[PDB]
Amino acid sequence: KTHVQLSLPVLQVRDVLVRGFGDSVEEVLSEARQHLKDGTCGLVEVEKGVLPQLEQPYVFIKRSDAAPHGHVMVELVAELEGIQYGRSGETLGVLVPHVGEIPVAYRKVLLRK
């Protein structure tokens, strides 16, 4: 399927134990996609002071359309030193590995895979 229904655990930035996916734009996108498939991917909602507490490169989920069955359609955009790889709509948050942190909520998304 080109799209997959996922419920992403929303993590508080200060709870996150693994603060990025890797060391290159291509690796963080690869690792993000693998974790999304394996259900080991969390979401941190971007506010003032969040991003400087996470490791670059960043992987964002961005709204790709205006929401089947409650699931917002999203795609992945990476960012390194202020340059983004991909072009999409509004940021829903920054993806991180999930390694057992307790979530505050769940964000239903339809991921373009």
Side-chain angles (χ1 to χ4, degrees), residues 1-112:
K1 283 177 190 300
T2 69
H3 284 81
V4 57
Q5 279 179 351
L6 301 171
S7 277
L8 293 187
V10 176
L11 308 187
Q12 296 183 322
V13 72
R14 290 183 189 281
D15 287 339
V16 173
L17 301 181
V18 186
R19 281 173 186 270
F21 277 115
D23 296 331
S24 80
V25 161
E26 293 161 289
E27 191 183 12
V28 299
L29 284 170
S30 186
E31 281 296 323
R33 287 192 169 95
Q34 191 66 59
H35 283 84
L36 283 164
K37 174 232 171 109
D38 296 335
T40 57
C41 183
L43 178 70
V44 181
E45 294 190 332
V46 173
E47 286 184 0
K48 294 300 199 284
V50 169
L51 282 178
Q53 294 186 75
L54 297 169
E55 296 174 347
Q56 294 192 51
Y58 308 131
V59 179
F60 300 110
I61 46 161
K62 286 178 165 299
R63 198 195 210 90
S64 70
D65 194 0
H69 315 269
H71 295 245
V72 176
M73 293 200 40
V74 298
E75 54 197 345
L76 301 194
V77 172
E79 179 188 308
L80 181 56
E81 287 142 6
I83 300 169
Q84 293 204 340
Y85 302 79
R87 165 179 211 277
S88 191
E90 183 180 19
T91 294
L92 275 78
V94 53
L95 301 183
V96 291
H98 189 214
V99 294
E101 300 93 334
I102 308 307
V104 290
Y106 285 94
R107 198 71 204 259
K108 292 187 293 176
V109 304
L110 194 51
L111 174 68
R112 193 174 301 168

